Amino acid sequence: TSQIVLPPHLERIRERLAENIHELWVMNKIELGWQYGPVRDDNKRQHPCLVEFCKLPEQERNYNLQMSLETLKTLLALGCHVGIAYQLTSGYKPAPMDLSFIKLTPSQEAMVDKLAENAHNVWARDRIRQRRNPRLVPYTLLDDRTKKSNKDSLREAVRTLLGYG
Numbered sequence: 001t002s003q004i005v006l007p008p009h010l011e012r013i014r015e016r017l018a019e020n021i022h023e024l025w026v027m028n029k030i031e032l033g034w035q036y037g038p039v040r041d042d043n044k045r046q047h048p049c050l051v052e053f054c055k056l057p058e059q060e061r062n063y064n065l066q067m068s069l070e071t072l073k074t075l076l077a078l079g080c081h082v083g084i085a086y087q088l089t090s091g092y093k094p095a096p097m098d099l100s101f102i103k104l105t106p107s108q109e110a111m112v113d114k115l116a117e118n119a120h121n122v123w124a125r126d127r128i129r130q131r132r133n134p135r136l137v138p139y140t141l142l143d144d145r146t147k148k149s150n151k152d153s154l155r156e157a158v159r160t161l162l163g164y165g
Helices: 008-032 058-078 106-127 147-163
Strands: none
Touching: 008 058, 008 147, 058 106, 058 147, 106 147
């Protein structure tokens, strides 16, 4: 996917998608019960990466930026053209719109599955250096119980792409 030049015309759309991914990364942790704290911990139910998109440093925004870039690059490599078409938290208000209403087409579901497959392949390539974790197998040879979580995590990219116009 990295062999594709990213069109600057959709750079703002990519940044918006990264912001949406980040705010989802906030909401899921908050639903789990996570607040905003200065310590990067998982058992203490706090996360220092729940602050506004503008206040995010380069040490915290690059992850969502890169997910947006790789999602759009993977879509372009697949072939479909890309172009023009509440719980009270501890400081952040992630709620762009109601993006869970329009039915996602089977084609877009398949593309979301392809994005999940690509992400899992990259993660497995990273993880083969560690032993013998059972998840080192490709996404096709993976257990079907955890496939839906990754597919849902990758669906919101195309969801935002369709909703934003």
